[PDB]
Ligand binder design. Sequence first.
Ligand SMILES: COc1c(NC(=O)c2ccc(NC(=O)c3ccc(NC(=O)[C@H](CC#N)NC(=O)c4ccc(NC(=O)/C(C)=C/c5ccc(O)cc5)cc4)cc3)c(OC)c2O)ccc(C(=O)O)c1O
Ligand SMILES: [Mg+2]
Ligand SMILES: [Mg+2]
Lengths: 402, 402, 517, 517
Amino acid sequence: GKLADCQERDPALSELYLVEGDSAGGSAKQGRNRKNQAILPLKGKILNVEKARFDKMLSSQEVATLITALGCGIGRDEYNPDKLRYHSIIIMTDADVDGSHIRTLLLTFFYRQMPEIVERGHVYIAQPPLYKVKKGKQEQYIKDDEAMDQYQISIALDGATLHTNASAPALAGEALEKLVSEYNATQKMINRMERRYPKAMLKELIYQPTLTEADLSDEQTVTRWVNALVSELNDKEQHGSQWKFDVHTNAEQNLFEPIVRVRTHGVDTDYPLDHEFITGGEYRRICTLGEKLRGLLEEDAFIERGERRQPVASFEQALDWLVKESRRGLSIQRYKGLGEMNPEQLWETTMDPESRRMLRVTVKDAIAADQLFTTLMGDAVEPRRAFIEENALKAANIDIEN
Amino acid sequence: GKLADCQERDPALSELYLVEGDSAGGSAKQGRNRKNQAILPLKGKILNVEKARFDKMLSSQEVATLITALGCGIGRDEYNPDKLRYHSIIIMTDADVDGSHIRTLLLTFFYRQMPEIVERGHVYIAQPPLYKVKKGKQEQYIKDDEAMDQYQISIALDGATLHTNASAPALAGEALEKLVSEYNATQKMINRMERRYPKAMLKELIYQPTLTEADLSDEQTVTRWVNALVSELNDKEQHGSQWKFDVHTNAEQNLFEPIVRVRTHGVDTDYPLDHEFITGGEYRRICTLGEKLRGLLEEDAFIERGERRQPVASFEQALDWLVKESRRGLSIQRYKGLGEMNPEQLWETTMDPESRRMLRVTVKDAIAADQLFTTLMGDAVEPRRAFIEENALKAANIDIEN
Amino acid sequence: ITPVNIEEELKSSYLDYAMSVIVGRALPDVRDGLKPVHRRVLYAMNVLGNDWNKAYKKSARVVGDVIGKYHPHGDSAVYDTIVRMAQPFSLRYMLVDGQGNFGSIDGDSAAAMRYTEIRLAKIAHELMADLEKETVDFVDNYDGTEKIPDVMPTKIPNLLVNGSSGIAVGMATNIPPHNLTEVINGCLAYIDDEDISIEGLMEHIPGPDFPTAAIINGRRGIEEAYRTGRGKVYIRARAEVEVDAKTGRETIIVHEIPYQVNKARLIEKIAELVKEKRVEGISALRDESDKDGMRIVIEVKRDAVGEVVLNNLYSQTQLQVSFGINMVALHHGQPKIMNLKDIIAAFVRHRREVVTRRTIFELRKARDRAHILEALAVALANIDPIIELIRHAPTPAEAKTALVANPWQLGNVAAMLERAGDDAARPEWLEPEFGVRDGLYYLTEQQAQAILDLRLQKLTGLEHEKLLDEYKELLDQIAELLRILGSADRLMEVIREELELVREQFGDKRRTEITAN
Amino acid sequence: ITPVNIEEELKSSYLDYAMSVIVGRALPDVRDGLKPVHRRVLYAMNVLGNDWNKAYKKSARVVGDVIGKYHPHGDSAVYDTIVRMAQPFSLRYMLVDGQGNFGSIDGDSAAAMRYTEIRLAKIAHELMADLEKETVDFVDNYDGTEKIPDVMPTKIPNLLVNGSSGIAVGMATNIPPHNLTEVINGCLAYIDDEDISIEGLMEHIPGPDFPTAAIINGRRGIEEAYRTGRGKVYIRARAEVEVDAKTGRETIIVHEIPYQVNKARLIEKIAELVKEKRVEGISALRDESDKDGMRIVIEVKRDAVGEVVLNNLYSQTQLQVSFGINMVALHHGQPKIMNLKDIIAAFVRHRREVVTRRTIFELRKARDRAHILEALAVALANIDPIIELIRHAPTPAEAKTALVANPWQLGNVAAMLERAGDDAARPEWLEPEFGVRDGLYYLTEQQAQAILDLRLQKLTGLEHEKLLDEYKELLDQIAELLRILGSADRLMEVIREELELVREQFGDKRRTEITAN
DNA sequence: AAATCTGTGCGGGT
DNA sequence: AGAATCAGGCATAA
DNA sequence: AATCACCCGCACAGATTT
DNA sequence: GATTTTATGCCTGATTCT
Ligand SMILES: COc1c(NC(=O)c2ccc(NC(=O)c3ccc(NC(=O)[C@H](CC#N)NC(=O)c4ccc(NC(=O)/C(C)=C/c5ccc(O)cc5)cc4)cc3)c(OC)c2O)ccc(C(=O)O)c1O
Ligand SMILES: [Mg+2]
Ligand SMILES: [Mg+2]
């Protein structure tokens, strides 16, 4: 039954793995420690015990083999968690959406059919890597995209990077790195809310000064700010766009209704701005960052790069050039699945007892878990659809602005 | 398994096909008259019963299935040809060398183990096509390569092609067809003697006048003749080879030969146009074609293809232009195997009673057939090697060439 | 070892999977009505140069190319997707031209990859028209090495004509086919009047039109489906009864069957039903279809009436089927339920955007070419000083600098250079330093290089005149493109002409009949 | 239903199959030692640009290209043929460089086509050297649509170096590998003296040289095989008996094994033999072969004697094998049995023919280029009248006729042509009418066209002098090529230089040791 | 004798 | 005691 | 060379229980 | 992604007959 049993007969120091796919199973068998480790490949997606009747569960081959491997019974008057084998159980699925679906199916089976095993804490989840980085000598593995981004930013400022503005400033580490990190955070904040506004307007508002609501007036003051913004936007284009504006008053404040048009005979007819937008904290942090981010570069400016010097304005291109310099002699690989990894990599990345990383599964509350399992894995479409709609991107549009 | 049976029960109106390959069998099962036709795919090559033992013959699976399907007995004191199902048997193998090998193996089995079946005439051979041609409206299948040449020639001279000599005569078909057929036959004869003489010499001799050996004797005009031939050969030479001539008067009729130094740095000692070559009929028919193929084309000439025109000054140019013009709106398909055909093509070309074509296998003499089978299919290497060497290229030099 | 609650893990994993499947696998895009796999397959076939009038290619070539380059999934799914688009009994207008064994209406099978060949269809070139003129946006592939279009610049109303069917988590979609000429007439009617009502649209679009040409039994569900996006219809086969006189024999002939029905299963189910005595009055059953038409023959007993047994068959077996119309599609990366007018409006907006972007690209190209032609024409009128300057210089770089240093008088070509509409034919990125100044021409570096690349053959009269003719033609083209960009009424005329041409080329006749109960 | 006799069908079918297998599948060619599948694979890899200093490609791509274009057979045969050429323990000098899992000496098997990658090896470029200079003939493919080489213009003695093995109908062939340096020394010795005997050749070629580096036992078989063509040799493994005193118990250590032997089957066979009390004095068996090298350990009993037990293993186990040398190859499209001198002579003749054809091609190219260069120089000598004539041209054709139909003055370049006289550089096809006649050049049509296709950029001094330099060096190149074609000694000197360069680049050391009985 | 319950198939994914 | 017979292994093909 | 046993939503016979 | 047993010639050792 594709089971590669272990050598240790004591049911307190053995392990069991539920590998996804056949190539990954073969590689795990190749690279395992045969003394106290077992393997059980899964060929495809398994039955959903939440929907299936009890009669059909016993007929299925996959769950039958799993029950035989575990050694405990199934059903009332036959289940006996005392007579247990393989006190450690690890999932170790792929790092894509299908892997997560398989993980949910396995967790549903373990919770519904054998609650005591999950309660006592014998279920673990592995965490293989995604990216591999090589630089000749220094090579390593990186999990998730966020860690890769952090590594890239750190390598961008791994020594050197002394930004000389006018005569001889020296940020010298902390100032430059902290400014870059805060800039990346603000860029992420802009990107998460990018749907509701254009990128050009948000990217130009940081360079513009504060709104100065104190001196605002119906005439001679409302027009100046909006006209300055529109003039600054118009003269930086490459797609044949156009920015125009109009303003109005409603006896409380002087509100703006800017308009833009590009590659379309239609028109939005409004990008309204009033007290609500200025009162928001997003604009406050944008202005706070823009106070530091101004035209500090004089007629002469450069960066004391390693045996390099690129004196230009438009610091974004300088950042891209620095990234290119960091990536000049760097090698990056993105794994596709567990099959690609060789047995040595699998042994040294997940199956090593003294360098691996895992997660332990625990149960906090019973009624909440039962309700969630019934809602998501049940055979009633409407609660599931409502739950998906509630937690959609609208719930992701959190207006904390921080 | 692996037998799609028919619904007919009377063993005098049934049929059986022994198809090569699994995909071809699957296609044939769909496109067949399911009332009174059956299929039996063959996966690969089968056993040679001449070299094998009876126990291994009964152990194999393919021959066992065939024996079970046929319904008769096996071996002496059990075989009974009266209890025969499927009075008609058809082979239908592929159209390559491996197909013929499989055909020979099947014929060996049938003749060695069931002589009565072969003698009564219950075995047939099927002949599927090779090419398919379409011209917008016309569509047809073509077998082998000779029929393709005939079809191409017929399409080339399909209407128009009124050859104009000087101002406006009209060969108009049949005379031109006879000239084309004679030219093709002479070219086919010329191609099969490149080993003994160069191609350029044989091609050039047709345009020069006949030697007229009757009046040659010792006029010493042979020197001028060979000088003219060598000058003509050296005129349009385009590979760096050089030519020379030599003569002598060993007998009453003077003899001569050319010498050529060729690309390979070696020099062939001579190619003498001696008594055997001049008196032979091959040279006589070469001169016969040459007499009608002298300078018939005048200073002004052209080939009158349908609603088209082109001035030419040679027969080969006219033929090549006609062939290239005839292939304008034509589409061709070539079948690499039986698995490339959809079921309807198989039905209408091989399985339809009113449009198929087959051959019937019969025995002429018994002792000769037994001797040939023992010589070729036996397990003694040396007689087989001697037989292959006898009919090798040494006996392929047929002096008829007609 | 770090703890984690089960609820958070379950929620995160299941939401990730569901949201990826909703906008990643199943639902189609409203603008062109294609799922991602179809778009990637068609784009890959386009890049290989597998046109509609060239030699065929093996299926394994295309499948391997797609899997290696764009689509990181299994190969069985890709091959099945390719096979489904080449069957005349699945799509109203096939998008692939196949050769080999691609299955039959009986649902038999399809041969493996190594035994079949494919190429693009003629209509499939209309979906990807003007793809090279920067009319759509490109996005990264699964590892940031290639580029894939975001949406095809379609010219046919693909979603309505071909239909769709898909299953996702929490929802699904099912849209039937339609006829091309009727949909084009509906689009033209919408363009002529935006405030048209559903009743007005239904004058041009009576209903669906399936490939198999069955009979639609009813007219009340179509209105509800087109007015709200959900409905239900009944599809009925075509059959009749004929009497040969003599002994008063009755026979039933079946010609046409409903949509998505296997003939073999129907025949064997009828055989099972008559064997079990659940249907009375049937004598024998035969199939006689061969290469020309469909025929199923049923014989009825001499002590029975054909109409009763036929109605019992309609009620029991699969000779009549139900079809539940339900329209769901992606609008801006979000699922949504739609009706006829929304689909038509989305198609029209897509066409407007594509035409505008194409016009901008063409205008830029024309302006650049006119800029080069001006320099060549001015250079051809001062031959003697130019050749003297080139001959005296020892190196090409020195000659280039000498050419660029001094201005050149226009000469006898001053009539046409100043005849343009001031700056109509002037590139946008050109500074005011260069160009036609007050009676003198100033050359840039690239104009100098173009002058140095000139041949002697251009000194003849005919070659000299062809350049001037080309320049005048370019001026006319620039004027036309500017006029198109100017007003909002020329664009609709262009769109109307394109739609009329498509209707004239790819139109055809109706198959399915619509009747009352 | 035409009849047909069984005898005729059997005879024709079997003769056709036998001849096709004999001259198309199993036997190699004496001139380069490659079967048709190997030649087609290498040619297909060459055409794709899959060189040795570029990125890898997938095996499926190359296999599909070979199957579609040249080789009309299945995928498994082609892939196994490709796999065998990339194994270091099969070929003495590998011809394909692979990345993936291509088996191991222990007995494993390679992965699938979808999981491996390949490219050409560095030495394989020497087999296909000077392929574009018309050094060999070309023949049609199966469907008469492509061209494939008839034989490679090889520069390595592949047949002797890599050996061969094949089973035909009625015959077979089996040839072992050899060492490259010894073979090159033998070829040079043959070039020095053409009447050398077999004893003279064996001074430089002691015997075979396998990749696995076993021992060869005996010497009579090698002499018999080289003298007649058929022989038998014995291959023995390398093993020793080791003891560290102390307890006085010795062990048998095996480092190497014969050619074409599986290690796992050997170990299990020894286990089965010692199980049934068939071999006495063996206590334990173990395999320590990993990474560093091969080591098999056999621990004998306390009372055992190492030599006594060791001598039985050669007689009983598979530690000693017999190799039967039998040389058969195609000479002029027919099989024949060869000996060493015939192979060496055939290789030398092939090299002579290739070099002669290459020289002729290069001479033709040089003369063709010089012809145009002379016209360009003469045209530049008289630029002002030329441009004045061209400017009054209604069309280019009239300008060409005006240029052709008059003599031209040589000017200041005629002195250079004093070196170019003596008919050294005139093309063969050119007539005496054209060219320099009486100090007045006469132009042809193509020279006039080349003049008309002249850019202004070539009026500078540097571009004027480069033409003269090119002409001056082309004359010397023509002289050297004519000198090579003029005699026989120079050809042999060139061949010796090429062989010495190959020996220097690709030479290596010996592995197998030959010993007496 | 009305009301639940159990199966089957359509098209892209392990 | 010694001939005669029977299996299995090597590389390109169904 | 086509086939393995499940996941996802909707509509519909034929079969058991109230 | 993993899925049978044959033809063809020369040589070995193991087993069966007289
Ligand atoms: C010779 O062929 C040809 C060609 N050919 C080519 O040029 C050609 C080129 C490339 C290729 N291939 C590739 O590049 C290629 C192929 C495959 C891959 N995949 C992967 O790496 C990854 C693995 C990793 N990491 N895979 C997957 O993610 C994967 C996903 C799903 C599954 N599925 C499951 O597990 C199932 C179904 C379980 C289940 C569960 C339960 C159950 O009861 C049943 C099932 C399995 C694997 C990657 C690349 C090729 O192959 C197509 C070709 O043919 C050209 C011309 C001709 C000619 O004649 O002209 C010709 O003949
Ligand atoms: Mg995956
Ligand atoms: Mg074949």
